[PDB]
């Protein structure tokens, strides 16, 4: 039994000082085993926050990350699932579903997760799974004006991912769940 936290595009402090309060309260140490971050937490401060939440943190370089180390793309395994990590600004068109599945084919991952759209999407196509948390802080996006802060955590059982999506719709946190089992 393992649960991981996938979140990105915090944009602190370019467009966001910090996360939403209810979010800040729901993320506590100990519960989260792994952390997969996609977007650009533009400063190492937020990186040490993500290292507060869990021990194994995996980040990838975004377009606005001033850091010196984050890789452009990473493929990490959790249990038995092959997970692919990429911010998503090299996946042109940015929100193209058909372009993302191509990255899946090149990567040969069972779950490919990306961001840079600030729009949360979780779907299964060609028996593969694609997740985009969006901005945990609901940052600014030039293409979308009604942005909803969100994050996703997946509890990889054994050849079975259940993904829960938290969203700050209005004032209270509304959650949804999508499930996927290995091909």
């Amino acid at each position: 039994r393992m649960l991981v936290l996938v979140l990105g595009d915090l944009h602190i402090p370019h467009r966001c000082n910090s996360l939403p309060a209810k979010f800040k309260k729901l993320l506590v140490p100990g519960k989260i085993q792994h952390i997969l971050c996609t977007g650009n937490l533009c400063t190492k401060e937020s990186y040490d926050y993500l290292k507060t939440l869990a021990g194994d943190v995996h980040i990838v370089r975004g377009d606005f990350d001033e850091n010196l180390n984050y890789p452009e793309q990473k493929v990490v395994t959790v249990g038995q699932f092959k997970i692919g990590l990429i911010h998503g600004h090299q996946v042109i068109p940015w929100g193209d579903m058909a372009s993302l599945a191509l990255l899946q084919r090149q990567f040969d991952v069972d779950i490919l997760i990306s961001g840079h759209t600030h729009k949360f999407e979780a779907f299964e196509h060609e028996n593969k799974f694609y997740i985009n948390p969006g901005s945990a802080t609901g940052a600014y996006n030039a293409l979308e004006t009604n942005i909803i802060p969100s994050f996703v955590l997946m509890d990889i059982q054994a050849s079975t991912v259940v993904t829960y999506v938290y969203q700050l719709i209005g004032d209270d946190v509304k959650v949804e769940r999508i499930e996927y089992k290995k091909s």
Binding site: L3, K25, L26, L27, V28, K31, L153, D155, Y164, V175, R177
Partner: peptide, 7 residues
């Protein structure tokens, strides 16, 4: 709904 966290 359920949660590995809080409600």
């Amino acid at each position: 709904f359920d949660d590995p966290l809080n409600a």
